[PDB]
Each structure stands twice: as C-alpha cells, then as structure tokens.
Copies of this chain bind each other. A is one copy, B any other.
Amino acid sequence: TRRRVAVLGGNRIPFARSDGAYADASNQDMFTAALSGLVDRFGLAGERLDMVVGGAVLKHSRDFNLMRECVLGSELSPYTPAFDLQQACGTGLQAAIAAADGIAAGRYEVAAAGGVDTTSDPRLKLVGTLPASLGVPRTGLSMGEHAAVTAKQMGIKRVDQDELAAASHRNMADAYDRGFFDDLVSPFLGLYRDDNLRPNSSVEKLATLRPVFGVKAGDATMTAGNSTPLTDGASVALLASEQWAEAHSLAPLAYLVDAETAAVDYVNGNDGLLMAPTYAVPRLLARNGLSLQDFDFYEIHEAFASVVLAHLAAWESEEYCKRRLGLDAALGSIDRSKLNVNGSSLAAGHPFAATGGRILAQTAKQLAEKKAAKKGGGPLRGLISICAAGGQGVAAILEA
C-alpha cells in the first residue's frame, strides 16, 4: 500500500531582484548553495538521498543533468541519483510530487525536491512582459496582458489588487522580524533577506503607480505594485518516509497526501492563461472528499494579485463553476485571513522553478506551528495552488 510522505522542511537562498545581487550567480551556483544549506540544516553530509529532483525553466546550455551535477558538487553521498524536471512556475511543487511519488511507491526513503531560476542572464523588469509560454505563447500577447484580460473579464478592482500585494509585503516582513524563516533561509552573496521585500508598503503607495498591462483595453488595474518582478532564486525541500524520519530523529512538520494537475485551452481564448488551478483544485478536493473551506492554510501563488483574486471570484461565481467546471454548485468563498498568511510572491518574488519549493516548505511549517503551539482535536490541512505558464496549474493538499 501507499506509505505516508513527510515534509521535514526545506531551505532556500533569499530571492534577489534580477540584474542586481546574484547577477553573476549561475543556476548551479544558487541551487548548490541552497542544497548546501539544506544538508547543513539537517546534517545530510555524506548520506545518500534516494533522489534529488528539480530544474530551471530558463535553463542554459551549461545545464545538462543540473540536479545530478549539483549533488556531485554538494556534500551528499555521490551515489545519490537525480534528474531534472520543468513545468514552468509549478516546477517546484511538481518536483515535490515526484519525490513523494517515489517515497510512497517505496522506491525512495528520502529525497530532495526543488528548483532554481535566474532571469538576470537575459524594460519593465516584470514577469508579465514575457511570452505566455515562457518561450524566449503564440497569441501575440504577453503573460501580463492575458492576466489583464481575465482581470477585466472577472472585474477585479484595483483596490483589492493593491491591498493583497501590500498584505503580502507586510506579512512577510513580520515573518522575518519574528524569525519565521531563520530555519528556512540561508544567505547567499551577502543577501540575508528577499531583495524585493519592502515592509513600508501600503495601499496609498501602490495607488500612485500607472497601470502597465491591459492598458488600451480600458480600465487597466495591473501595475508593478500588484505583479511580480523578475527575480533570481533557488529553493529545495526534504521529504522522507516516516521510518527514515524517525531513524534520523527528525519529526515530520506535515504530510503531503494528494495533488492534482490541470491544463486549460488558452490559445483558443476559452480559458484564462493562468486560470488552470481553478480546474485542478475542485477535483482534488472531491477526490479526498473535502470542501473548499475545510482548510487551515490557503497558499495561493501570487503571479499577479489579480490572478489570485480571480481564482477566488471564479470559485465564488455560480456561473463559472456551472459552465467552466460542470459542478452544479459554487465551491464558495474562503476565509481570506487564512490566505498566504506569511506573505508570498508579490513580497518575495518569482524565480519560476524555485517558488514551488518555497511554498511547500512554508506551508508545512505553518501547519506544524499550529498543531504544536496550540493543540486540541482534529486534523489540520493546507492547500497550495500554483498558476503556471502554458496554461497549466498544480495543486496539493497537506495534512498534520
């Protein structure tokens, strides 16, 4: 039968804005730093991991067997195998799914899963400006303007966009000030904090930025304050079977239980480019017999503030869930207080392949922090969903 899969935490360098710090940092540099941080934090040195899986999205020609060559440049046992994997922004979480798959089938006892990306190697400096399929798609329309179309279609007010962005910044700043990421971040090139972080941000400071996506379509509400910037980063997370975790005297923070992956028909124009998770989450919850509100933590990747709010409005609109999903009902709304509680992409940034890893580690820790600091009866749950270029999306749910 399928074993339980345990997230024992992770590690990641801070995310730098592109063409700044980590401007000379190769993919391999940043990821091998990240992996070294993981091995130090959990003392894996000289031990054999059953699998390291990850990759880069904008990988270069010097990136064949990137994961394998990183572990060979690492302190892990050289008998540790590895392979690469890229699903755009969902690369991180999907690598996590791969590692969990191997653990549950019983082929792995322990494994690392993550990603790394540098958009610094390549004038707004924003993710929206790139092709829709991150192919440096074939619609004569950048990721940003696809999302602008969906924002207008769904009527996401600018105030809520700016408010979500500022909330992300302020909550991640609080998390830093409280040391939430001390056991989750290792410095790199003299950077100890997420470069793009700006803790003195508010809806007033954001309101004064000109929209720069969906402009001539009228009623543009997307700007550099509510849309992620081009950022370098690396991240990884460690997973293992329960027996491995006890044998090494490390306790699970949470368990990855299930996931779902979904595509959309975006070249045809029927579905929003970054609207795939809206299809993934519902059949995920159904397969595990859960509602959209039976969760303690909603970690929704914020590739654009508007995309997050559009996912939620889609899930609140009877019509959308009737026609686009064939649900006979609206999944309902969520308690926004349990949404990205400690900040996210608008604060940290979006190094495509790393973000997944980041989210996973965070989600796990948060779940554990709640089951331990306070206690009672009941299982605790988190739901991650990540929108991804090429009209794809990945969702997972974790228990504690």
A residues adjacent to B (C-beta < 8 A): 1-2, 46, 48, 50-51, 55, 57-65, 68-69, 71-72, 75-88, 90-91, 94, 97-98, 101-102, 104-107, 133-137, 139, 141, 145-146, 149, 152-155, 215-218, 258-270, 276, 279, 287, 317, 319, 322-324, 389-392
Contacts and interface: CB of A to CB of B under 8 A. Distances in A.
B48 A218 contact: yes
Given A55-B84, A85-B86, 9 more contacts: A46-B216, A59-B59, A77-B218, A78-B216, A79-B264, A83-B86, A97-B107, A141-B268, A145-B268
A261 B65 contact: no
So how many copies of this chain end up in the complex? 4
A134 B64 CA distance: 7
B323 A154 contact: yes
A221 to B, nearest CB: 13
A354 to B, nearest CB: 16
A273 B156 CA distance: 23
Given A136-B64, A268-B145, A391 B78 contact: yes
27 contacts: A55-B84, A59-B59, A62-B135, A64-B86, A64-B133, A65-B135, A68-B263, A68-B392, A69-B390, A75-B216, A77-B218, A78-B266, A78-B270, A79-B264, A80-B263, A82-B263, A83-B94, A83-B392, A105-B105, A107-B258, A107-B259, A107-B261, A145-B268, A146-B268, A152-B270, A153-B323, A319-B319
Contacts of A276: 81
